[PDB]
Write a protein that binds this ligand. Structure first.
Ligand SMILES: *OP(=O)(O)OC[C@H]1O[C@@H](n2cnc3c(N)ncnc32)[C@H](O)[C@@H]1O
Length: 392
RNA sequence: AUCUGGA
RNA sequence: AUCUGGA
């Protein structure tokens, strides 16, 4: 019933009129101290990798340092920063700054002590924002001091391959087309983000570029805005009604939002959606839940804190089908570990499709169409993805 | 449950 | 994208 009273909506922008955006300026001393920490750790070989990139579109020759951690390092207690996605720079006047700040690393239920359901009830306060987890690759956008718009993927920017478009360049091309539609320029977006001292955080979803799990055809393809972060060492993020307002003003597609006050209603909603893996007539792969947390409870200040809840089925089966389809075209015996009966039928359908049209083999080997193949099989059986997973 | 090690 | 040894 809770999955029928709560619906993900993209119309919270009208409710942002009374809300005020967070803002904090950068302290060069604090930034310098952060970079001193990270520069030492990259020289110990708590491991850190540092990669320097030139910003091609910068009129002043700006450069950025990307800093990458081991994903498990973020469980350690005293790191310099818990940002996942971090680019630093020096302006033309020599001031060291954070150019791009992703979200803090966040974890699944029962992956860490803090993400045990008992810990979430204890240490967190609502309201709780459930944001729909779209599935592609992350794109960061910010504005440099010289007016340049910076577009990055998780850890990189620019293009290496002359043949293949990098993820960061593909995100930039989608942003270009999105601004031209609404008569705005990259320079305009760069000045607004720098004014807010902010990184916009979006998901690139486009099957013509790269297929993942769910299908994003032409009607659903583009940049999905899901966060805005302050470019500072600690983690401060916009409320999601303001994120949706920003998306409308700058031509991003919006990320569905549900607001639930009580934490017990949250688990109830999530464990209910998990049975189908679908909500509001749409396949959902997960939610990111956003709230407030403190150190020792009821004391100290409250900080922005996330956790994710990812639905295992029918998606674990879809990955098995993708892996088995790769086995067919490469001459290997598919590894059918679970969902044995329904998977064996899927493979006979696939072998059948590759006989009619041999051009499919070349497409499936370029990692394209495997998602259309899956839905065409499910249509052929009159089944929904969640039903094939429950056949047991 | 918990405690502890690696990645 | 997160797995894993032991008591
Ligand atoms: O485990 P994981 O890679 O799925 O980690 C989370 C990643 O999911 C992407 N994403 C998509 N939608 C969201 C929302 N609403 N909030 C936060 N992250 C989101 C990001 O690319 C992230 O790295």
């Amino acid at each position: 019933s809770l999955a029928s009273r709560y619906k993900a909506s993209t119309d919270y922008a009208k409710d942002a009129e009374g809300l005020t955006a967070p803002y904090v300026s950068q302290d060069p001393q604090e930034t310098a101290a952060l970079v001193r920490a990270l520069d030492d750790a990259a020289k110990k070989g708590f491991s850190v990798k540092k990669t320097r990139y030139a910003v091609a579109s910068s009129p002043t020759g700006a450069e950025v340092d990307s800093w990458r951690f081991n994903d498990w390092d973020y469980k350690k207690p005293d790191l310099p920063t818990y940002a996942r996605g971090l680019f630093t720079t020096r302006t033309q006047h020599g001031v060291p700054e954070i150019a791009v700040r992703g979200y803090d690393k966040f974890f699944n239920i029962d992956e860490t002590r803090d993400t045990a359901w008992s810990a979430i009830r204890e240490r967190t306060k609502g309201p709780y924002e459930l944001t729909l987890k779209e599935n592609g690759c992350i794109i960061f956008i910010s504005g440099l001091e010289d007016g340049t718009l910076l577009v990055c993927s998780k850890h990189s920017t620019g293009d290496r391959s002359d043949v293949a478009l990098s993820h960061s360049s593909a995100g930039e091309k989608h942003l270009e087309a999105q601004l031209e539609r609404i008569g705005k320029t990259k320079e305009e977006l760069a000045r607004e983000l720098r004014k807010r001292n902010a990184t916009a955080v979006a998901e690139l979803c486009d099957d013509s570029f790269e297929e993942h799990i769910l299908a994003y055809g032409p009607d659903k393809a583009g940049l999905y805005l899901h966060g805005i972060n302050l470019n500072i060492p600690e983690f401060i993020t916009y409320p999601s009604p303001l994120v949706q307002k920003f998306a409308e003003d700058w031509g991003f597609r919006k990320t569905g939002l549900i607001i639930i006050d009580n934490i017990d209603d949250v688990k109830a909603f999530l464990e209910e959606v998990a049975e189908t893996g679908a909500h509001d007539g749409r396949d959902v792969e997960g939610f990111v839940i956003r709230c407030k947390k403190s150190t020792n409870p009821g004391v100290g200040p409250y900080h922005d804190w996330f956790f994710k809840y990812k639905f295992e089925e029918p998606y674990l089966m879809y990955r098995q089908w993708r892996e088995c389809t790769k086995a067919l075209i490469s001459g290997k015996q598919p590894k059918i570990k679970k969902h044995v009966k329904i998977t064996e039928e899927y493979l006979l359908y696939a072998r059948k499709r590759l006989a009619a049209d041999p051009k499919l083999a070349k497409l499936y080997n370029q990692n394209h169409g495997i998602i259309k193949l899956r839905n065409d099989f499910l249509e052929y059986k009159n089944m929904k993805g969640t039903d094939a997973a429950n056949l047991e």
